[PDB]
């Protein structure tokens, strides 16, 4: 994580992920990804 | 507007630009004033460019 | 669901043009620096 928008937002309401995967998902917002596709690809395997 | 403000505000727009700009252009002679006028030509302010062109051309001339 | 039996042609030349290019080139991005 190690960022103000990567770490503080990941534990606001209920929180809880893998930290490296949460940092990768926080970095994926800057990678111009479609919000639904990455979550669908994660949910179709997890 | 309060007293006298509107036709003293018009001067203030003529004057406050110089009170910053000539205070950045202190001491520079010859082409060194022209290199300051480069940095002030690349200014972000678009109206101040035309409003000070009268003096900026008497640097360039 | 049902398969139209023609898109595999385009898929074969697609994977060929990606994989064989990348396979030989990426390894010899070493050679450009190692040689």
């Amino acid at each position: 994580t190690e960022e103000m928008e990567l770490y503080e937002l990941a534990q606001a309401a209920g929180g809880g992920i893998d930290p490296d995967v949460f940092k990768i998902l926080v970095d994926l917002l800057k990678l111009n990804v479609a919000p639904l596709a990455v979550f669908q690809m994660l949910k179709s395997m997890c | 507007l309060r007293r006298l403000l509107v036709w003293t505000y018009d001067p203030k727009i003529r004057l406050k630009t110089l009170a910053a700009l000539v205070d950045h252009c202190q001491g520079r002679k010859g082409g060194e004033l022209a290199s300051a006028v480069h940095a002030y030509t690349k200014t972000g302010d678009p109206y101040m460019r035309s409003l000070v062109q009268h003096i900026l051309s008497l640097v360039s001339h | 669901r049902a398969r139209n039996m023609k898109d595999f042609e385009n898929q074969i030349t697609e994977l060929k043009k990606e994989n064989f290019n990348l396979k030989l080139r990426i390894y010899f991005l070493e050679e450009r620096m190692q040689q």
Partner: protein, 95 residues
Amino acid sequence: RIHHDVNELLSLLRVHAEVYIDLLQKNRTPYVTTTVSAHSAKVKIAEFSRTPEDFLKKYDELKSKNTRNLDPLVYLLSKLTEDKETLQYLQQNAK
């Protein structure tokens, strides 16, 4: 282009065929900015009312921060509807 660190490594980092097809399913375009969020998705934090003042106050501060990455988190605020299918793995990982 750079799918090694954030697609290949992110696909490999999952604890669970679609091993290589997950990157094609999550094939992001770097030239886009098309968030599917709306203002209706702001009520997703209201379900987690353990301390709702410090669950509703964070969003204005995250918007007041100068990053534009707060927009795609509409589906990520709801996250998984399964019971702790991402959150509970950290307790096993910490051991």
